[model samples]
Target: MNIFEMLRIDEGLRLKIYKDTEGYYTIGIGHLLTKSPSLNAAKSELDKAIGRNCNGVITKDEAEKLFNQDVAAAVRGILRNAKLKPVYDSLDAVRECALINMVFQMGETGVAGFTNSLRMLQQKRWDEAAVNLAKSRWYNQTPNRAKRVITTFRTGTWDAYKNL
Candidate 1:
């Protein structure tokens, strides 16, 4: 039930400036999208608009939409953001997609986020990074989700997440 599937854009929408005391709005989003029936769908729609892979973890570009950059800018910013150096330095396409997808969901600001595990990665703290990566704010909010991603990341098998 992602956003595009929810919002009635009753009409086609173009991005409009949006703000909430966050200072200047660097971009615009479709206002009618708010008419969406499901916030979950809305979020998913937002991620897709920003050029995320959609099928896997979001790319850095997708993660930066919160700051209003277009997908390319966002992804570039993330690559230059230092925190991603460790993780990005080690990930292949699949692992990169998996972890960045987690970042796209959580943002780059928590222990479960980029910087925290990135720090572990920099310090060569493999065990700590793996543990910290799974302990997210939304961890308990959605059970089994992390388990699925983590399992696939480690074993390269989707045995338990076949339909995912």
Candidate 2:
């Protein structure tokens, strides 16, 4: 079976936020969170996945290795579903990454709901697309993050975004 498909099935294909039986906050294919999701979050997830204490948590190098694999799968998913490749390919790196981030965070079906935004993106009407991005329930649910994404789409800069 395909790796992504296997991952989806094994992880139960969750697309929204939920709490696992262990009381951890989780979303989309078992992505767990710990409030801010930097050191604290990584430490919490590591503790649950392994028998590790905070001191025993994975280092940045280890995290980067795993992060690369997860990101590869996410990129595969985007390529599989992206029908408007010209528009997608034409974007600057920052703008392109914003779409990739959305695709992973929300998944293909979730992205499909952003028709106006997608249409604007395909047309290379980036300002319009940015505006459309902020007009959604997603924007309402995550104003700060949404603003950062919108900023990238409009300016192709990562200033407002904090990469992990």
TM-score of every candidate: 0.45, 0.61
Number of clashing residue pairs, candidate 1: 6
Off by over 4 Å in 1: 1-74, 111-116, 119-128, 156-160
Tens-place lDDT digits, model 2, residues 36-120:
4355564566566444463323444444444455658666766676553545677766677777666655666787678788788
Score residue 49 of candidate 1 by CA lDDT.
62
Question: What CA RMSD would you report for each candidate?
Answer: 11.5, 10.0
Model 1 Cα lDDT, one tens digit per residue, 1-164: 12221111111223432321213222232222233445455556555565553432334433334333322343454576566645656665444544544443344444234566566655656566667767765556544656655543454444434432
* Candidate 1 Cα deviation (angstroms), residue 162: 2.8
Lowest summed lDDT over 10 consecutive residues: which window, candidate 2?
Answer: 1-10
Candidate 2 Cα RMSD (Å): 10.0
Model 2 ranges with Cα > 4 A deviation: 1-24, 27-65, 84-86, 162-164
Best by TM-score: 2
For candidate 1, give the lDDT. 0.44
